[PDB]
Every structure is written in C-alpha cells, then in structure tokens.
Amino acid sequence: MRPEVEQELAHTLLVELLAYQFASPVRWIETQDVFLAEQMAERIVEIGPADTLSVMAKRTLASKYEAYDAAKSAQRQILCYSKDAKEIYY
C-alpha cells in the first residue's frame, strides 16, 4: 500500500469509527483483554481526575488474569494520574 493510500484509509476508517462510537456499545472488557493478554502491558496508566478505569483493571486482573500473570511471571502496575504522581514522575 502506498502511504497516501494508507493515510486515506486511516482517515476514512478513523472518521467512521468515531462517527458510530456514540451509537455503538463500549467493548471495554475486550479492550482490557487486548492490553492484558495480547499486548502484554506490564504497566497501565489512567489519565483522568479519578481512578475509575484503574479500579476496573484491578478487578479484571483479580478475576481473570491472576493465574495467567503468575504463570508468565508478569508483574502489573496499574496507576492513576491523580493518585500515583511521584510514581509516574519520580
């Protein structure tokens, strides 16, 4: 694919995704699965005023990935911007 073509397809696809998003369900379980299982994110940061998705990720880990992380020796760091400042910034 030529870069102009990739940029065109990316522009069209991104605009369609966003155009439908507010009229389509949020599939956040599967989103977390991509992060925790597929992409092997050792650390996840919630940007935001509150730790809402950090709390969700904690629960998902404990309910679904604890044995998986133990088997892979994976150690996970879930951090929220408004709580974990000196960690995120040293």
């Binding site: 065109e8 966003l18 369900p25 949020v26 599939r27 998705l53 990720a57």
Partner: protein
Amino acid sequence: TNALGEPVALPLRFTYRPEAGYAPIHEIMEGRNDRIKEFYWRCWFGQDPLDLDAPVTSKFDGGEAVITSEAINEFVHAVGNTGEAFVDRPGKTMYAPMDFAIVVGWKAITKPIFPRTIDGDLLKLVHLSNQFRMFPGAEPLKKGDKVYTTAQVNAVINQESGKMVEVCGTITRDGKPVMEVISQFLYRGVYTDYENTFQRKVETPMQVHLATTKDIAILRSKQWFVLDDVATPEEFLLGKTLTFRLHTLVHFKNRNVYSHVETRGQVLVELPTKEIIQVATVEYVAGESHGNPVIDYLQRNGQSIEQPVNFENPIPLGGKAPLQLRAPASNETYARVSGDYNPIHVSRVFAAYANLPGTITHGMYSSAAVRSLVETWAAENKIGRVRSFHASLTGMVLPNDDINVKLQHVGMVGGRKIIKVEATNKETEEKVLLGEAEIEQPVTAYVFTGQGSQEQGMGMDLYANSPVAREVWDRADKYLRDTYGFAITDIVRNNPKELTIHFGGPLGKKIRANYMAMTFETVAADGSIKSERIFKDIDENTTSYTFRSPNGLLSATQFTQPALTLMEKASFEDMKAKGLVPRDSTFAGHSLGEYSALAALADVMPIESLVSVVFYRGLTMQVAVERDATGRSNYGMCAVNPSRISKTFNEEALRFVVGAVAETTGWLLEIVNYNIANMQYVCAGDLRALDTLTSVTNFIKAMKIDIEQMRREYSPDKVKEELVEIIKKCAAETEAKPKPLELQRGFATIPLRGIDVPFHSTFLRSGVKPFRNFLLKKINKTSIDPAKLIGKYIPNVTAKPFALTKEYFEDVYRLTNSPRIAHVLANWEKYQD
C-alpha cells in the same frame, strides 16, 4: 601459551658497544614495533595471516561465530553472574549477556590496531573505554545465534597522553545489525605524525526551524547548503523545520588545525503526505580552519532531535545493600573465556618489562562484573531493557583487588531511564570505572476515562505549574472565546450556574452565526430526515443567549466533555514533556476518553478541533432525546452486576434477559457498556424498560431461577416463554407506577442518576450521519499518521488494535453497516494497486 596453546617469543634486540663503556647497551629501535605487533598477533590469532599494511580505512572481518551454552556458562560463571536468562535451567531459553559481545567481536575489534600506519608500541597500549549499544528493536543474543562481526576505525587522534584509536565493531545476526561495540585504545607516548590522523563523526541529527525569510536568507547564503531541487522555492522552506543528518570526516594538520575538514550529508523536509525527502545536500570543505562553520552554525541556530530530561534529584540505586566486588586470582581464567590472551594480564616478565605494578585484571572483566550489578538492580535483572552501556576504564585493577560500586538514575530520554555508574577501588578510593546505561521502562499502555469523573478545579494545579499544560488550556480558551463566546477555564474554576453570550458587534454576529449553523438531524417516524437547529432559541434577530445548569455548568454534558478532555490532554502533554513516555505504548479511552487518547497520543486533531468536536458531541446528544414540558427525558442507564443474581447467571444470561425484555415490551433496552466480565455491565434504555429489567432480575433472584440450567434442560423457546410471562407481569407493574417513573435500586441493578440520554445505544444511530459530516470538517487527512494508530490505537467499537487490512474493514462493516466502509470494500482493489 598463545590462542593455540603454544609458546611464543618476543625478540628484543640490542647492540653491544664496548667503546661506549659507561652505556655499552643500545636497543635496536628499527622494526621494534613490527616485532611487537607480530608477537601480539601470534598471541591472539596464532597462525592467522598478519597484514601490517592493511589500510586504516578498511573494514576488518572477525568471521562467523555460533553462540553456545558452554561459552556462555564459563563466561557467566567466571563473571560470577546469576543472570537467570543466561542459565540453561530446566524449561528456560538461554540468553547471552551483553558483555559477551566482546567475545564474539574480539577478532574484528582488535585487528585495526596492528596496521603500520597506526604506529605504536603495543606493550604501552591502554584500553581507555568500551561502549555497547543495541540497535533499536534488536532482541537479546541467545544460545544458538549465528553472528558475524565487522569493524572499522572511527578515529586516530594524537593526544598529549598518546595516540588514541577508536574502533567500532558491528555485530550482525541474519544479515541485520544487532549491536555496536565501540572501543578506544591509547598508545602511551608522544606522537607528532599527523598524516594518518583522522576522525569520523556521525553528527547529531539536528533541527532548525525557518520561521522567517531572514532565517532562510541566512541559510541560502551558505554555499555548502547545496539545494537539490533548486527550483524548490526559498519559502517552500518558510515555516519548516529542516532536519540535518550529517557525517564529518576531519584530518589533522597538527594538534590544533585540520589538514582537511570534510563535512557532508542531508537536509530534509516532511511533505504534506508525511513522506520525507532531502531538499538540500551539505557539501562543506575547509582544508585548514579554526572550526567547522556548518556545525558551529547548527549549535548556534538549532537543536538535537532528542535531549535528556535530567533529574534534579539523582535516584540512589542498588540491591538491599551497597554493592561491592572482587578481582579473583586467575586473570588467566578471564583471558581464556574471553580469548584475550594478552600476556600483561597474566605474565610477570611481560608486566615487569611493561613497567606495571603486576599482571592486570582485564578491564572487560571489570566491565562485565559491574554491568551484572547494573542489570540486576537498574534493570531489575531484566536483560533486554538495557539498551546501551558505556564504560570508561579510568583506573587499574590486579588480582585480589576489592571494589565499591554505586548506581544512580538521573534523567529520562524518550521514555528510557538514564543511569550513571561509578566503580572505585575499596582500599585506594580511586575510580576504576565510570559508566552509563540506558534502560527501558516496563511495557506501558495508556488509558483515558469516561464522563462522570469531572470535578471543580480539575487540572488547575498543572495550569499553574506547567507551561505546556497551560498552553493547552489557553489555546482552548482562545478558540472557544473567539468561536462561541466563553472560556472553558472559567467554567472549570468556578462551576457557575448560568452564563450569557452576547452577539453584539462583528465578533458577536460571527459567534451567533456559529450557533445558528449548529444542527442535528432526527429521523421522523416515517423515516424522513428532519434537520433541526441545536440553538432553536437563537436566530438572526437574537442579541444574546444564556446557558443554564442548576448543578453548575461543569455538570452540563456540553461543557463537561471539553473540560475533561482538555484536562486529560494537558496532563499527558506535561508527562510527554518530561520524557516519561515510551516510543510504542498502546492506548485506548473509555467512551469520551477515546477522543482524549487520540488527541494525546495520535495528534489526529489540534486542540481547536478537539474542543469543537466534543462540545458539538455533548450538544447533539442532549437534543437527540425528546423531552417533556419539564425538560425530562424518558431514558436512563443502569449498571447491572450478573454475579449478584446467582453464581450461574453469566453474561449470556444477561444478554438473553435484556433481549427478551426489549423484544417483549418493544421498549429500548440494550447493553451499552461491557466493563467487567460477569461483574459490571451498563444497560441504556427507556425508563420503563430499565425498571422492568430491575423487576425481572429481582424476580429471577428471589425465585432462584437458573437460566443456564433451564437452557440446558429446555429448548430456548420454552425458556423464553417462561421469561416472557415474568416480563409481561413486571412490565404491567412498571406501567402502573406513578409518572414520572423513578428508577429504584435492585439486587443486581443500580440506576445511574443524572444520565438522561441512552449513550452508546442504537437509538443514537440517526446522529451518525450529521456527526460524521462534522468530523470530516474537523479531522484533516494530512494530519493523520497511520504509524501512530496502527497496532497502537484500540477503538471502543472494534476493541481490536487499529489496522488497515481488508479483514479489519470487513469487521468494521459487520459492526457498523457503514455505507462508506462498504464503498471502500467494494473498491478495495483500487487501494492495493
């Protein structure tokens, strides 16, 4: 013993002169360095052919080497290292420590010291420093790797202390470079031969931004700035950052003056496609000079493409104790495992002749030994996270010496840690090694959150203390004031209830026109599309308008959305400015947070477009819902927790019940957020449908109905029939309740108060077309970098890494039924050609 296990002799020659009776012994200096070089060659390479006349500009080959467990084990155990990845423990893949690069590169790296053009006494040679560097994306060496090493002389420089020779060896695996090893050697002595002295330097990739014609006139003054396409206009470069990739070769006339400056390379532009080209060559020569005007200019007018965010507080590091080390007795053990069979490390007579205090422990041993601490503590004993490691060998070591080490982390670069290293002899306190490691953070992913987290004053501390965060807010305020007549910071700081925009004057007329132009399309019951203006109250005759919110305007969706997203963006820009963010973190954002994630990591839209989008989104979603004379909607949302019904009640059972309620009643009811498996879902719909769902789930729990058991014992239709009778009863009870219907907390259902729009439900599909048309005006194609999206962005709709493949477009078509995606798919071949 030599590399072949055979004895080898160094012949020193003298003339006896009894006529010179006070000093009758004269050393024969002629050919002395050649005899020494031949001896060292036989020591390290045995019977390999010696070429003393090999050009210093040539490439030196080290040959093919296969990395074996035994070679690793002896090296690793000799350097005393519990590097778990390097252990061939049961079930574990076996890796090689980065120091082992010296073993496989030794032949290539040492050959360049032998040429006669590099005149120097090897008995007086000192190894000054060694540097390891892994190529970007290159994975650790392991048991079974086949590697090839080639080396080149970067520099030959006469210094006060001696002749310095810098050699760079490149280790390649499967035809690709994996690691560079740079070694600096010093022949101690006084050298005045400048004819073979040179330095090759890869210059910093520099940048200069041509804000003004004056800058470009300054640039095009330079005869060495040789434009490529000279028909390219001067102001083609106006407002462009030129990027400069340059290599400099200098030869020395004497200590202070070049015999020849040569300096060349490429000056580069990024095109609107985001493709890059050269638009000028750099073509400079001086012969002699007191500097190099090209480079002198760049340091004075431009900047490196990367810089270290050095900490003001150096972080102390180590294990649980301060770290200390020891030289063993047998330098021969290291000489063996390394293949550095150099006698001065091991032989009394050679050490004594070389005027050493004794036979010396190899600096490479010390380097590896120290880097074991480095990896163990600075990289948490995780090998691939170490990317590059420098070590200046600043003091001498001998058998049974003892050593103190300290490690500190003192800055960031591109999401990588900056670590400095000092090793000092414990008894003499002298520095023996100084060094530096760059190390990866853990694999990090970035998450942005939904509406509902907003608070008064959010982000204002950053606004006060961070210039980059402040700029995000100031740009937003300027745009929103110029376009819509308000400042978002005023709303965030004060959370006022009410606010009037005045359309007085030319600016006010423009602001009013922007509001007049705001519309949303509704699908009437006959299927016809009716456009309706958002600001029905405003018209060409309206002089002013007032926003209102009793919980404060920060609680109003149209302002909540901008405010939150700006705060997130400002946060992330501060972090990015502090260099905390790795190159390839992946990302997502829960409903609204998605836009922030895209704006923050993918830069798909500028701040002005971002705030426009999320303001318009908030407005459109409020007006898409029909409201009664008191402004109330008949819609809401409920969080549902299946595990609170029974242990067997899962996501499928919830989907079955929600679908059955929706189908039986004809009311809108859909699962719109899938947050935590079998624990947290959100349903959006008609208040009656949500109340009926609450009653049905309460009934299922109270009667201990096991839907999964019923689905195993009965046909799906029979399970549905039993549920339908329960649903009809619950729906009749719901309709008998007083209006307005107030949602109550159930055993498994929790109403989300204050949400009166069924977000993410199919009800809002009518708004997709006008909102798409708005997005197309706010997101420019040329702004898109696919490399920021592909694999890295995960959309909420697909919940998969973003990809430009036919299969991904087919999946998006299946989920959205988009006519535009269908058109792309029906013409897919045109995009493959």
